[PDB]
Structure 1
Amino acid sequence: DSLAPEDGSHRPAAEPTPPGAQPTAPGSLKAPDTRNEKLNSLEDVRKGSENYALTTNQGVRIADDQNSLRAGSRGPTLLEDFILREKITHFDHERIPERIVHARGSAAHGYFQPYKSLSDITKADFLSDPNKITPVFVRFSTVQGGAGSADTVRDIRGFATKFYTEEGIFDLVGNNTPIFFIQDAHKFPDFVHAVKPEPHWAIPQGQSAHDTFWDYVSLQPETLHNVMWAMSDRGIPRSYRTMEGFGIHTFRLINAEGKATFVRFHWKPLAGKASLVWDEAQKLTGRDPDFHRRELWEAIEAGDFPEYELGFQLIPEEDEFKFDFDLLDPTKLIPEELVPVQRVGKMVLNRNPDNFFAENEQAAFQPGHIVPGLDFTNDPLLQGRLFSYTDTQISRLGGPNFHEIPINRPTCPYHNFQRDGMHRMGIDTNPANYEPNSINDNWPRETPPGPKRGGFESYQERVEGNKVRERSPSFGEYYSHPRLFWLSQTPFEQRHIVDGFSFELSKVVRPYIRERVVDQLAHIDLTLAQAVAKNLGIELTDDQLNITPPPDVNGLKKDPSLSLYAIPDGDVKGRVVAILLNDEVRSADLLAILKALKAKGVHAKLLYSRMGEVTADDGTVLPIAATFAGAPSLTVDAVIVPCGNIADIADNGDANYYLMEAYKHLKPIALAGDARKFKATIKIADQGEEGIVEADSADGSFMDELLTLMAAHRVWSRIPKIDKIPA
C-alpha cells in the first residue's frame, strides 16, 4: 500500500552518524561511496528491491502474498499452491550448521596497506609496495558459545582476517591472546569438549565456569598460560576495537633469495587496549547480549573505523634454539622485551556487510590459506589445523565449492582442472579436465617459483627422526610463562585475575577439582595461589607453601607489554557517555558538555525516565535516546549529570542506581551544580574524590577533567571503596 511515513523518517541518512541517531542499515545503503576491489566485485550478486515486483524464485509475479490457496475461503489448503510451497520450503531450509568453534562472531569489510616494501624478508605480493592496497574481510568472535550466545562472556576472542591478494587469498586466523591452551592438535577435541557445554544436559553456554573445563585444566598444566590470560580482564574486552590480535604460531617469511625468517604476527589496536570488569561483563550478557556486534557495526556507521597495525616479531633461523622455551610451542609467547614487534602496515575496517548470513555466516577462513612468500613451521598445533578447516567446510557450507560463495571468492584469477561438486557455479570451457594434456596445449599451466608471480614451493626444511607419536621434551615446561604473565600485571589486574579464578572455581561442583587447580596455581606463584585458596576457603599445605617458583623467562621478571594498562594507550574517540536528563536542563551545561565531547569524537546518549522529549530551560527541545533502565550504565564509558531541575530525578530509583552501577564498575562520573546532590547516593566525600568530576557548572575545566579520566578508561583507585556499595 503505503507504508512509509510521508516524512521519510523510515530511512537512515547515507552519511556517518553517531550511535543511536538513526536506524542502522546494510553497508551498501548506509555508505554507498565506500568501495574497494572486493566490495566492487560483490556487485554482481547484490540484489536491490525498491520498485521491483514481488515474485517466486522462478520470476513469476505474486498477486496475493497474504493467503494460501484453498477450496472455499474456509476450506482446506490445496497441494497445487506452488507459491506457498516454494516460500515455506525456502524458509524451512534457511539454517546451515554453525561453526564448530567460534560460532559467535561479527564481521566487517576494510582494506590493508603496508608502510614500506618488505621485499628483503618476504616475496609476499601484498607486502611488496606501500601503494598496493589489499581488500580485507575480518571476523571477530568468541570461542565456546553458539551463534546465538552472548558477546561479553569471559572467553578467548577470535580475530580472523581474509586478505584478497593479487597472488591468492591469505587468511590470517588468530586470537586475542598470544598463546593457545594446548600443544598438539590431536587434543583439540578433548580441550574443546571440556570447555563446551557438558554433554548430558548441554550447560553451560558461553562459559568455562564448570567442572569439565577445570578438570581438564587441572590434569593438563600446558593449559595454564592461556588460562591466566582468560582469567585476566583480557577475557572480557570492551570492544573488538580495543583488544590485541596474534597469529600465535611461529610461521616463516620466505624472500626471493629463498631465505627463511621465523615470524609471529601481531595486530595492535589503534583505539588502545581496554576491558570491562567481570560484574559489568556478566550483567551486560543479559542487558544486551549483542553488545560487541552492535558497537562494532555502529562504530563503522559513525566513522570510528576500527584500525589495527600489523606487526612482526622476527627471528633469524640461527636463533631458533636460543630461548628458554621452544619457538614451535604454541603455549609459549615471545616476550616483546626480547624480540620487539616491528610495525608492518595498517588495516582499516570501514564498511559493514549487506546481509549477515550471506557474507558473515558463510565466510570461510583457513590458516592453511597462505601465498608464496609465507610458509609453515612444525608447530604441532598448527600442523593439525591445516587438516581441519577444509574438512569442516565441506559439511558446514555444503560441498567443495565454498570458494565460489561470493564473500569467499578470490579477486585474482583462479584456473585448474577441478570439476563438479555440489552447487558448482563456474562453467568450465576447457576441453581438458586433466594435466598433462595436449588437447588444450596443457593450459592452465604450472608456474616455476620466482621473485614475483611464481608458483608456490615449500621451503626445503630438513626433516630427521623416526615416525613417532611423541611430545617434544622441549615443550615440557608449563609454569614460567604463566608466572611471567602474572608478574607483569598491575596490582588491580592481579586482583581481577584472582577474582576470575575464584568466581570460576566457585562454580565447579566437585571440590577436589578446585583443590587440584589451586595446587597448580601454587606452582606458578604463591601470592596468587593463596589469594584464590582464601576465596575458596581452602588452606595450602606446608609443601604447597614450599614449591619453588619456576625460573624467569630468559632473565625477565616482567614485561609491561603483557599488561592491558601498565603503559597508557587510551583513546577516547568512539567512546560514549550517558547524560542523565531532567525536565528543565540548564542548556548552558548541555552545550558545554556536548561540544567538548564532539571535539574529541566522544558520543553521547540523552537518557530520561520516559521516551519522547523534554524541554531545556531556554526552550531547546531535547529528544530522548532511551530510558535509564533501557540503556544501562553497562553500555557506556562514563556518566554526566547536568544541572537543571534535579528534584525531578533526585528520587528516581533507576536514576540513582544508574550512578551506583557506573560507580561500582569504576567509570568516571561528572556532576554539575545541583547534580552534586547525587554524591550522597554514591557516599562520596564532601571534599570530593579522584574519579568524580564536580563543579558549580559544566564549564571550563569540568569537561577537560572528565575527558582525562576517560582517557585512562577506569578509576582503578576506587576499587577498595566499591566493596561496601550494595549494587
Structure 2
Amino acid sequence: NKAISTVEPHYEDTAPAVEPMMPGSDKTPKNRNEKLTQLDKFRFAPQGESLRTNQGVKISDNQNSLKSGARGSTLLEDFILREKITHFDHERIPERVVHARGTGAHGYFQVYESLASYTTAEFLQDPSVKTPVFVRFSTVQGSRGSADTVRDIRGWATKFYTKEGTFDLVGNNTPVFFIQDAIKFPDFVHAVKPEPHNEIPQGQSAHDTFWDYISLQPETLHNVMWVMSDRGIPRSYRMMEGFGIHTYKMINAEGQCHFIRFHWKPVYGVSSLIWDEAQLLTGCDPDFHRRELWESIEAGDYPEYELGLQIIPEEDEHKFDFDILDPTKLIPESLVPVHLVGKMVLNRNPDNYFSETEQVAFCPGNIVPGIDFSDDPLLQGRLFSYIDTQISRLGGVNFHEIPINKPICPFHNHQRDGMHRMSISGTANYEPNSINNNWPREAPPTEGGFTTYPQPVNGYKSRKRSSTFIDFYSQPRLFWLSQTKVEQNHIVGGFSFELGKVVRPWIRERVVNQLTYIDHQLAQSVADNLGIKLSQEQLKHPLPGPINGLSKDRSLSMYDGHHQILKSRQVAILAADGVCGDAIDNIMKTLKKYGVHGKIFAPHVGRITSLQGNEIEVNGTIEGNPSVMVDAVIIPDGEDSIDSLMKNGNAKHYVIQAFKHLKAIGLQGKAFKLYDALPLPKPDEGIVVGDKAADLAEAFCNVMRGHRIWSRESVAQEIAG
C-alpha cells in the first residue's frame, strides 16, 4: 500500500519532520550588487506551486506515460511526456573549445583612488562605486567533465559590469602565453588536446603531440617553464596570481596613452600543490577547486584580489630588451613595478550553474572607453575569436540577452532579429533616419563615445614575424634562475614525468635539446631522468644574457617571492570513538583563532563519542577524505581512538601520505604511538608532538605557516606510501 503510493502521484509533503552546499540566494542573500539585482527577475520560487508543462498546464501524474491500459502501449498523444523528454533531450549545448572546465562566482570591484591621470574608464574613476563582477576560473585542455587539479594553465576571466559598458579582462594565471601570433592557436591547441585518433589523454599535456610541437616551436618554452613549475598546480583559485598578459593601452582625458599590463595579486597568498598530491586529488575529488571556491564563499573566506597595473609611458615602449607587444615576454616587476589600484571581492555563488557559469560569455574585444588595444599579434587575433565562437556555443547572435551576459547600462542600437530575440523594438532600424529623429544617436567622444587612439601605422602589408620577437630563451632562463632550489626540482620533475609518457624517443631528446639553451643543469637533470646521454656540444650550448641588466627576479618565485596565508586552510582531525573531547575542543578553538578549518574525519559518519561521553559531529570518513584534501593533519589523544586508528590501514596511510607530501602533522600524547609504529623516519620540524592540546595546536599552527616541510623532500622519496 505504501510501496504502491511511490508509483502514484505525490501530493503530500516529503520533507522530514555541517550544512550542504546551496545556491547563493539561499546561503548569502545579503551579499548583493547591481547585477545580482538585475538577475532576480529571472529567478523562480516553486514553493507552493503546481508542477506544470512549459505552457502553464498543471500536471496530475508525473509518474506514468499515457498508455492503452495500465499494461498497454504508450500513446503518441501524451504531450506531457513528449514535452518533458524533448526538453531533456536538448539540454546540452557545446562546451567551450578551450577552458571547457570552469567555475563561476559573483562579486564586486572597487578602485582605491581615481585613475583619471592614466585612463577615462568609468569603473576606474570613483572609489565609492561598487562595480559588479562575474569571474569564471578554468583549466584549459580538459573537457567539461575533466578534473580540477590537473597540471595546466588556469584561465581567469572577469566580467566588469560598468555604467558605460561591460568590460572583460580575460586572462590566465601566468604572465606569458605559449605562442606569439594568433594564427598558431589552433596548431598549439590541437597539439595539447587529446590526440585525434583515440581522444587520449584527458586533461594532460603529457603526450607525444604536445611535446612534438614544443620541440619545433621554441617560442613556447617560456610558458612551458611556468606550467612545468608548481604554478601549474595551484592549491586554490583563491591562491594564484592573474595576468591579462597582453599590453593594452590606457587613454586619459587629455588623449595621452600609457602602455598597461593588468595583474591580480591574491590577498590569500600564492600556494600550490605538489605533483603527486595533485594527481591523487584528481582521483579522490575531481571537483576540488570548484568545491573549495564554492565553500570558501559560504564560509566567509571570500576570494580577494588586488588589481595591479604596470604602467609604461608611450615614449618608453622601445627601451627594453624585449618587445612589450610580445605575449611570450613578461615585464619583470623589478624593472616595471605593479601599482595596486583596486580590489575585487568574490562573495556570492550562483543559483544555477548552467544559467550563469556555463552560459557566461567573455571576450577581450569587450573593452570600454579609456582602454584600447595594442598591436600584440596574439591579442589582435583573439579579438575576432570570442564573439565568433559564441555564435554556435550559445546558439546565435543574441547571447548578450542571456541574463548573465546583459550589461547593466543601456544598450540601444539598430541591430534586429537573430535567433531567440528577446527585445521588442518599435523604432527605426537604420541610421541615419529621420522618422525617429535619429534616436539612438552617435555619442561625441567628449560624451563617452568610444574612439580609437590614433596610433601611427607605417609599413608594408606582409606576413612576417617581427625580428624583435625572435628571443626564445632569455626569459625562460630568467624564470629558471629566479626559482628556489625546491622549485627548480619540481620543474625538473614536471618535464621528466611528462616526457616520461612520450612514446617517440626522438621527441624527448628534441625537448631536452631545447632545454640545453635555457640552463645546462636543467637539461642535464631532465636528461638523466629520461636515460638520455647529452653530448658535450650540448652541455656547451650558449646561454642568453641578462635582460636589462637582470638575471633574477624574486617576484617570479612562488615561495621566495610571495606570502603564504594561514587563514582559510584546512586541517584533518583524525579521531574515532574514545577520542579526548577536551583535546578536540582545544584544537578547534585554536584553529578557529587563526581562521583555519578543522574537519573531523572518523571511521564512520554521524557522531563519535568522546571518552568523556559527549557526542561529536563528524565531518566525513577517513576513507572518503584522504590526506590530499587537507593542508595538515592533527591526531588528538584518546586510548580507544588511537587503538581504533592503528587497526585502520587508511588512517595509518593518512599519516604516511601527508608525511610524504611534506605536510605538518600534529600528534597528541598516545597519538605518537601511531606515528612510531609506521615505517617513518623520526619526527622533524613538521612533526609537532605534545601532551597539552592547546599548546600543541598553537605550535602546529605555526608550522603550517611554512606551507610545506621542503627539507623533508629527500627522505620523502624513500617512503613507501
**TM-score normalized by structure 1?**
0.97
CA contact (8 A) 2:109 2:133 kept: yes
CA contact (8 A) 1:241 1:296 kept: yes
> Matches of 2:325 and 2:336 in 1, distance apart?
15
> Matches of 2:677 and 2:222 in 1, distance apart?
41
> Matches of 1:248 and 1:705 in 2, distance apart?
41
Could you say which residue in structure 1 is the equivalent of 2:654? 658
> 1:228-627 counterparts in 2 under 5 A?
228-430=225-427, 432-450=428-446, 453-627=447-621
Post-superposition offset of 1:3: 4.7
CA contact (8 A) 1:277 1:665 kept: yes
> Matches of 2:13 and 2:719 in 1, distance apart?
50
> Matches of 1:71 and 1:384 in 2, distance apart?
60
Give the secondary-structure state (helix, strand or coil) at the position aligned to 1:566: helix
> Matches of 1:207 and 1:300 in 2, distance apart?
29
CA contact (8 A) 1:210 1:507 kept: yes
Give the secondary-structure state (helix, strand or coil) at the position aligned to 2:265: strand
Q: Can you list the C-alpha shifts for 1:458-513, whole angstroms capped at 9, x where unaligned?
A: 00000010000000000001000000011111110000000000000000000000
Could you say which residue in structure 2 is the equivalent of 1:695? 690
> Matches of 1:24 and 1:649 in 2, distance apart?
29
Q: Can you list the C-alpha shifts for 1:98-153, whole angstroms capped at 9, x where unaligned?
A: 00000000000000000000001100000001101100000000000001111000
- Between the two proteins, what is the percent identity of the paired residues? 65
> Matches of 1:82 and 1:2 in 2, distance apart?
25
1:212 and 2:209 matched: yes
> Matches of 1:419 and 1:613 in 2, distance apart?
61
> Matches of 1:481 and 1:681 in 2, distance apart?
49
**Which letter maps to 2:429?**
N
Post-superposition offset of 1:253: 0.5
> Matches of 1:39 and 1:574 in 2, distance apart?
26
Q: 1:524–1:682: structure 2 CA closer, same or farther, 3 Å change rule?
A: farther
Post-superposition offset of 1:699: 2.4
Post-superposition offset of 1:567: 3.2
Post-superposition offset of 1:582: 2.5
> 1:178-197 counterparts in 2 under 5 A?
178-197=175-194
Q: Can you list the C-alpha shifts for 1:64-90, whole angstroms capped at 9, x where unaligned?
A: 000000111111111110100100000
Aligned pair partner of 1:679 in 675, 678, 681: 675
Post-superposition offset of 1:29: 1.1
Could you say which residue in structure 2 is the equivalent of 1:18? none
Give the secondary-structure state (helix, strand or coil) at the position aligned to 2:559: coil
Q: Can you list the C-alpha shifts for 1:159-209, whole angstroms capped at 9, x where unaligned?
A: 000000000000000000000000000000000000000001100010000
Structure 2, unaligned runs of 5 or more: 1-10
Post-superposition offset of 1:4: 4.1
Could you say which residue in structure 2 is the equivalent of 1:12? none
Could you say which residue in structure 2 is the equivalent of 1:138? 135
**Which letter maps to 2:488?**
Q
> Matches of 1:73 and 1:434 in 2, distance apart?
60
Post-superposition offset of 1:682: 5.0
Could you say which residue in structure 1 is the equivalent of 2:8? none
Post-superposition offset of 1:6: 3.5
Post-superposition offset of 1:717: 1.2
Q: Can you list the C-alpha shifts for 1:653-672, whole angstroms capped at 9, x where unaligned?
A: 11100011111111110000
**Which letter maps to 1:669?**
I
Farther off after superposition, 576-585 or 455-464: 576-585
Give the secondary-structure state (helix, strand or coil) at the position aligned to 1:135: strand
> Matches of 2:170 and 2:397 in 1, distance apart?
20
Post-superposition offset of 1:47: 1.1
> Matches of 2:85 and 2:649 in 1, distance apart?
48
> Matches of 1:502 and 1:119 in 2, distance apart?
49
Could you say which residue in structure 1 is the equivalent of 2:4? none
Post-superposition offset of 1:226: 0.3
> 1:151-190 counterparts in 2 under 5 A?
151-190=148-187
1:632 and 2:629 matched: no
1:722 and 2:719 matched: no
Could you say which residue in structure 2 is the equivalent of 1:10? none
CA contact (8 A) 1:663 1:682 kept: no
CA contact (8 A) 1:122 1:254 kept: yes
Q: Can you list the C-alpha shifts for 1:579-622, whole angstroms capped at 9, x where unaligned?
A: 00032111221111000011111111111112222111222201
CA contact (8 A) 1:568 1:712 kept: no
Could you say which residue in structure 1 is the equivalent of 2:86? 89
> Matches of 2:119 and 2:704 in 1, distance apart?
41
Could you say which residue in structure 2 is the equivalent of 1:668? 664
Could you say which residue in structure 2 is the equivalent of 1:57? 54
CA contact (8 A) 1:123 1:373 kept: yes
Post-superposition offset of 1:684: 5.0
> Matches of 1:557 and 1:682 in 2, distance apart?
45
**Which letter maps to 2:515?**
L
Post-superposition offset of 1:2: 4.3
Q: Can you list the C-alpha shifts for 1:185-242, whole angstroms capped at 9, x where unaligned?
A: 0000000000000001100010000000000000000000000000000001001100
> Matches of 1:35 and 1:608 in 2, distance apart?
38
**Which letter maps to 2:609?**
T
**Which letter maps to 1:575?**
R
Could you say which residue in structure 2 is the equivalent of 1:13? none
> 1:41-120 counterparts in 2 under 5 A?
41-120=38-117
Farther off after superposition, 304-313 or 605-614: 605-614
CA contact (8 A) 1:580 1:607 kept: yes
CA contact (8 A) 1:590 1:642 kept: yes
Give the secondary-structure state (helix, strand or coil) at the position aligned to 1:264: strand
> Matches of 1:718 and 1:154 in 2, distance apart?
23
Q: Can you list the C-alpha shifts for 1:281-325, whole angstroms capped at 9, x where unaligned?
A: 011111110000100000001111100000000111111011000
> Matches of 1:6 and 1:401 in 2, distance apart?
44
Structure 1, unaligned runs of 5 or more: 8-20
Give the secondary-structure state (helix, strand or coil) at the position aligned to 1:309: strand
> Matches of 2:582 and 2:658 in 1, distance apart?
25
CA contact (8 A) 2:109 2:343 kept: yes
Post-superposition offset of 1:651: 2.6
Count of residues paired in the alignment: 709
1:705 and 2:699 matched: yes
CA contact (8 A) 2:156 2:242 kept: yes
- Aligned-residue Cα RMSD (Å) equals 1.0
